[model samples]
Target: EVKLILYHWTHSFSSQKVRLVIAEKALKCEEHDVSLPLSEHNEPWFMSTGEVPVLIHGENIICEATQIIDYLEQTFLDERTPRLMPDKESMYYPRVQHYRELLDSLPMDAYTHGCILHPELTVDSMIPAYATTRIRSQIGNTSKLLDHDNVKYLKKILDELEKVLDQVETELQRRNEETPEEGQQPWLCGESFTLADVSLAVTLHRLKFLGFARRNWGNGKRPNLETYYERVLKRKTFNKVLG
Candidate 1:
């Protein structure tokens, strides 16, 4: 009798991550779509930190994608197979947490990318006629971010994203080299899929959706990444969110 509700927008990368985790756990939850273009997220009744993908579990509220992932994995461990995080007693537990944090810390290039996609929706288009003080502040910040020059800012974001992807590729290579017996499974940590994989998969999915796959990563620039992405996409949960 668990009542879980998710407030999110479809194109949002953060929302995509949370949805993937929910599908991975095979948990059923009521979902409410928040329309960003219509400024529904800026409504007075919904005024807060001005973020979507909020999870409401009865009286409890989970704000942030990474936290929501941890909460889902911990609360519903018995309902799922292949735990997202290692048990606390395991030696790789600390390492798993370390990788999750690093993966989560990667830059979110989706917002800038979206702005590029919809050139008509300039910064001013987002300003609602009526907004609470906090919502106004949040809108202002978003406006500033989206108002920046698309070409210049996109290049910066792409460069930064490249570094992060390189780091992930290197880590995966290291794991493969170390796990001689495991023999190159798709999991980021040791043998089983962990939160680190979820984090990285979502980020890569965003890149793929944004056309970065062909533009920046084409011509087999990174064979490991290309193969890894294919393997990650093979997961049933991965297909669930993408659709």
Candidate 2:
């Protein structure tokens, strides 16, 4: 068996993406949580490239979440279907990059903001707060791009996300109508769980935590989407990482 080691900070959105991929593949990997503020990710010895989220598999250091996921697909998961990077055409690269860029920004807009806004919690629960806050402060210089008149502009980007999610709900309904499951289960991407679902799940969960979700985020207006959310959350691996 290959010895896989992941360097990540828990509860970070990018790390969530990496963990989802790891769990889906059932790969044997150990995680080292690099608590920010307590440890400097930019310290030359910690990360020679001065970047966080470096994955070490033997002698290889894989940086960046999506890239690390793609690397894992090529390395330990030959049997897994539905490769995440479906297209290599130059035209498709930008779309993929844009999607990932959005995922990479959640730490600042959602997780970290929660901590800065609420400071009375005990240390046990607030460790995530500390780490996430560090992420926000680290990225503070570039926040102008994500802010508009002091409001998080990223929430507006979510309007586009709603359309995509609504489409997923619609198609999953069609899939069940064509070939129904035992309980009319609906997945984000048709019948089977896939990378797209993982991406959407992580974001939606974080959005729910930030109290930015619509009133019926899981149970109110979109039953199809609600069912899909339950389905993904039922996965033991994903459920275990809800923190």
Candidate 3:
């Protein structure tokens, strides 16, 4: 067994992704909870990015959610679990990477920060004591978030998020068109549930939590994405992490 330590906060979206992947792989990892709103992530021990969900494997440390997921796959490639990637020679391999990129590029902080700054959200009361300091550093003093300029910035992020959701709708439709009639292609990367699905699912989960799904995907315009979201939600790994 590998010595795995996960440093993260409960509400961090990126950290949630790492948590989902680790649970999906059925791996045992010790938890090191970082208080983001409290500025604990800013401590010297953490990386310069000041992000949570940092993974430590034995003596080696892995930063960033993407790197952590890839490390998990490579380090634990055994017969005990199902494969989450396509073979390099497969036609779906390139498509999988493409989806991964688009999902990674999705503006997560836009929705999250926007929600935090929203007048109705009351983010301050929701977060724990430690988070207050770090959150203030990002959005400024709670009162300052209501200023004209700050409000506009938050709205602009919502607009950016809408565009990303549009892109997801288009990609899902395009993949459906390319699949052969007899073939069974359901997940983002085609038949199999690969890392691409993991990336997008985690992103969508965050969006849903932020109360953007009703406004964005509320109508029946994006049936494919709707179905995909439901499918991912049914997974034991997703429920365990997202719950």
Candidate 4:
């Protein structure tokens, strides 16, 4: 038996992403709430560089969210839990990688705090106050967050996310025709719900919360995305992390 400890915050996107995986496998974790509002993540003991969730299993320290989820998947491949990662031999596995990268492809700081530097968006009610908190404290760091590299800046974030949405829309449409409504898995990749669905589900969940769903896909814009999100909502694990 193994024990997993998770250091996370409720509003943190990375924390929520790992939580989705934990809930999916029904893995029990020792959860420590690190409040961003209080700047608890700034402490030296935490060892974070824009880091959110730090997972500890025995003596091994896991710091990245993608790597954290991968560790979970590799460690817990029991028949009791649903397999989240696709096998490399499967044709759909690369598709899973494709979708996962597309879904995860974005600049988080720039996307959330871009308006602080540009005044470009006002999508949700909760973000302004929280953004203000981060803005006020890290105002000086804004230059690095929006200046360094592609992910640090707000350049074409909307453009890339829109491209991700378009790519998934077409894939889901093709998959829908190949399978039935009362189908097997009905996930982004076929037959089984893999990590790609986990990425997409979490991505869509936050986007909807941030009020981008209607702007991009609601009102009959991208019907497949809407339909897939409905399926995602119906799943208990999505509700567990996001409800």
Candidate 5:
């Protein structure tokens, strides 16, 4: 059996993204919950160049989330499920890469800062009050670097996401259209759920959680996305890692 060790900080959105993967793949592993100030990820031994989301798979240390996930899909789940890479199965390598490039943006950084700045006194808050208060002072150090137009452009990024998300419905419609009058692949990729679904599901869930200024996309505005979020959240692996 392969052993996996995940180093992560709970409530971190990037970490949350990975948890979705763990859930989707039914991956089993030992988890190390690193606390805030990121003391663990900063350690030289844990991360050669100091990055979070490091994975210890045998003697190798994976530092980046993308690299770590790619390694996991390649090493652990490759034989069990069909690989999610476009070229690996379909001839849509370029399209997959393009979608992936879009996924690489940093809405979480701004959104997280916004959350930390505008701390909500919720019953189940992961961020401590003191920490939230302290982090608020340093908020927008990076956001200011963007030009005035680019600052306004942040909402555009979110809008672009809605467009991508609309693809979920389109893909579903396409599946319904092409069904053999029998059954269809209930997943975004088809038949079996794949990593494409995993990543997109996480993003949609995060956006929903953050209360982004979209078309009120909770349950009413978009029933399909809401259903997707609920079903994905129920997965034991996702909850185990993410919660």
Candidate 6:
């Protein structure tokens, strides 16, 4: 009997990929959720410092999404559970390492906070922090957000995101070109989904929710990524994590 405890935040970019890995392996885990917005990650446990999901298996405590997912892949390799990593002998093993680092390096927190701070870029939805009444502060709040203290810092992070996203798209373009133009195969690195797919699948969803889908890859902007995004979202495991 394997006892796995997952410490994570709800619906976060870093958190969801680990959940996606758990779902992909069809593993049952005890969920101990923590929210950074509420400063729960900073509480007594000291479970993480920006590495959202922390997974525990016996004496071994794994932190971060790729590390946890890699440990799971190695520990649970059987006839049933799908192999999330490519064999070390194959060319795609290093490919997984490359893509994993690339995707995980994104400034996820800045992008989120930046959007929230810049109200023009955000489409806000209130989730009933209680149901609400009519008490509020609306005195030039629009300009207030624009000139906020961290707004300049937020803009810098957005530029970093743009560069990294371009890197992602360029690689996808290379993959398509590498394959026969007459017949294309799906997936980022191997014949089937590997760790790379897990990284990107969740990332695309995050960007979509953060209102950067069209700005990043949609409306024929990054055509390869746009197609890949559609395909990744169609996977059953992707929905499993989402649900």
Best by TM-score: 4
Q: Count clashes in each candidate, considering only residues at least 3 apart in sequence or on different chains.
A: 0, 0, 3, 0, 1, 0
**Rank order (by lDDT, best first):** 4, 3, 6, 1, 2, 5
lDDT of 1 by residue, 1-243 (tens): 878898887766778888888887778888777755545453322221346578988777998876777788877767435577777988778767877787677556443434334433223323233432454466568744543674576556667767777776777777667766455564776677777778878877666644566544546876667777888888888887876
Highest lDDT against the true fold, candidate: 4
- For model 4, the local distance difference test gives 0.74
Residue pairs with backbone overlap in model 2 = none
Clashing pairs in 4: none
**What does candidate 5's lDDT look like per residue over 1-243, in tens digits?**
768888986655566666666656667778786855545434211110234688898888887778877887777655665465645546455445555555556455655444334444122334456655554454545233332244354555555657766766565555556666565335555555566666666675565555562443554666556655677677665566556
Candidate 1 wrongly placed segments (more than 4 Å): 36-49, 79-81, 109-111, 114-142, 146-153, 178-184, 215-218
Q: What TM-score would each prediction reach against the true structure?
A: 0.72, 0.66, 0.74, 0.80, 0.68, 0.75
Cα lDDT computed for each candidate against the true fold: 0.66, 0.59, 0.72, 0.74, 0.58, 0.71
Candidate 1 whole-model C-alpha lDDT, 0 to 1: 0.66
- List runs of model 2 lying over 4 Å from the truth: 36-52, 78-145, 152-155, 181-186
Candidate 6 lDDT over residue span 8-88, tens digit each: 878667778888888878888897877655443333121113445789998899987767877998888778888878788
3 against 6, candidate with superior TM-score: 6
In terms of lDDT, the poorest run of 10 residues in model 6 is 127-136
lDDT of 4 by residue, 1-243 (tens): 778899987777878888888998789888887765545454312111465589999988998888899989898787897778777898988898888887777655455545443334435423445454555576556445353463334546766778878999999899889887684747888867788888888888776655556667867988988989998898888887889
